[PDB]
Amino acid sequence: EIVLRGCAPTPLAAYLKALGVLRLVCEQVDATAKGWWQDECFMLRTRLDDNDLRRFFIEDYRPTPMLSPWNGGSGFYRKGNETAWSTLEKIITTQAERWRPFRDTAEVMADALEHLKLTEKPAELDKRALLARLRATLDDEFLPWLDAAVLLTDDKPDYPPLLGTGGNDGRLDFTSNYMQRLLEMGQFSPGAAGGPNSSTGFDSGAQVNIWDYVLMLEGALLFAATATRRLESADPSALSYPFTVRPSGGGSGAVALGDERPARAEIWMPLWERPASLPELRVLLGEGRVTLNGRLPRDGLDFARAVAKLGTDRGVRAFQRYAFMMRSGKAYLATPLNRFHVHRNPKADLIDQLERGDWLRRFRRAARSTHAPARLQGLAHRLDDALFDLVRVADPRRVQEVLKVLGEVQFYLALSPSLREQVRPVPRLDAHWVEAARDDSHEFRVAAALAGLDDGLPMGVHLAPIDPVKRNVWAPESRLAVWGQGNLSDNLAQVLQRRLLTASRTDLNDKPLSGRCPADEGAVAAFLAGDADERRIAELMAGLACARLPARLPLRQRGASEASSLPMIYALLKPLFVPDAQLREAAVLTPDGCLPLPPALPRLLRAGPAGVGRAVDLARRRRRADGGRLLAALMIPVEIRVIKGFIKR
């Protein structure tokens, strides 16, 4: 038994790579070999060893002739570029035994395309005709790629999501890249080329592990021809692979609603407990029958509920959920998702407001109405998914998802008078939706700066019973919970004192006060000027401290507060507080070696205008070597350029 530790169940590329390895090993001589998940890895049972497997792939492995005239992938297309032609010519000018299938397939597809007699490209009806001809002229080893990439249908074509627009993205195809990688030996992987989700420091010329890509495309072929329509209702309607439903952003976290709304599809990949041979996997991945029962599982939540019911059969231990998300652009990425569960939740109480006047029920009751096309039913399904996700995970982006689906529903209903008649006027909801919903004002930036501390300890350990190890759970004990109520300055002062005490007891000389969702000089000025809303800042900070912090929300900022109303005393005192690392980076004359804030300074600041004068005298004396709001402002995290600006002044 071989452990393919280069493969973990994620990303989707790795799962497909495992399937491709198993498929190739089985098909080519080792038919009854078996392949199952274990140890965060794929397991293979075969009479190949590691060395036999490597020799197989290096010296004998015939790749599947992935060539697609149904898109720009046969090697013969009007719109294209030179490298692809050079590649295809080199492959056609082969006579190697390993390349024979590619030559035959390319010749056949060229002949079919010529038989189309095109100007530049064929149309949808012509696409179906071309697919039929290719099916009638290809051979056994090619047809799995045809079945995976494209469909033959009664009324209109539709493109399976796993391979984009039919093995194609935009106006170009995966087959040319596949060929180029082979000779060296779009939508492919977020682990290599994902949207901004992790710490920075990477660059490449659109590079990918070539074996990963090849084996991924090889494994994608196990998704078979039984991707039929849901014979439901009475007009042309849903087509999909097995295990396919649209995605919901429960547990997504490092994802934005601008990508959820256009999400192409969601696919649930089974994981299983014992070695499984290829034909059983073909049955499993061909049927994947989660499509039934008149209120169809259009989206992921119904799939999850079926899993909970064991409606998705046992033997499959788990499903790895993947969402094809549009990364605010022209491309879709197969984003993996981590797992959360239905349980008690304070933000879930928000949903009760939607139950006022029974609105939600009425809306749901209206959704089936077929005079509203499948769109209304799909929106109702999406709303149910978003609400269940809100119950599962208390996160501002889930609240935003619910609000966005509600807005889309409202727009759709506004376009339909008959539907407008069927639901009574909406009940009043409470302001807590908004406060949990998106915020990004000066209040929000100050709150996120205060909440987004990253010296190990999150701000939660002060505002709530929290510990850094479990940031969205009933966590272990980090005992700094000294927060309070009402106006924000006193509670921030208490947090500063407790952080200084914790630093002294840990003996952290550099105060743990660095934050990485910072405010700005304008936000700090608005706070200091006496005009910003303190209470909303406090509530937003408490909310933001609740969970594992996401990559970042869509930031949409606002202008600074300044009209001859921004003091210098803040600049005089700030260098005494800033994390020493940062300060040392900062020009300030003050020492570099780290420091627990000069002993008496916070108390003097809290002692009022006379106390502020004493604090200024003390700061002057140390640098040679009104209060409360000023202290709270001094706590706010901001970046080094502001400190440089201060020093210049």
Residue numbers in the entry: 9 to 193, 227 to 666, 682 to 705
Paper quotes:
Here, we report the composition, structure and function of the type I-G Cascade CRISPR effector from Thioalkalivibrio sulfidiphilus, revealing key new molecular details. The unique Csb2 subunit processes pre-crRNA, remaining bound to the 3′ end of the mature crRNA, and seven Cas7 subunits form the backbone of the effector. Cas3 associates stably with the effector complex via the Cas8g subunit and is important for target DNA recognition.
We predicted the structure using AF2, which gave strong support for an extended structure with a mixed (α + β) N-terminal domain and a helical C-terminal domain. Thus, structure predictions suggest that Cas8g is a highly divergent member of the Cas8 family with a C-terminal Cas11-like domain. A poorly defined elongated density that runs across the belly of the Cas7-crRNA crescent complex structure was observed in our CryoEM reconstruction. The density resembled a bi-lobed structure with a larger head closer to the 5′ crRNA end and with predominant interactions with the first two Cas7 proteins. Using multibody reconstruction in RELION 4 incorporating intrinsic motion we were able to improve the overall quality of the density to ∼8 Å resolution. We separated the N- and C-terminal into separate rigid bodies and using DockEM we modelled the overall structure of the bound Cas8g protein. The Cas8g subunit is clearly flexible and consequently is observed at only low resolution. The N-terminal domain of Cas8g sits a considerable distance from the 5′ end of the crRNA, and this together with the lack of a Cas5 subunit represents a significant point of divergence from the other structures.
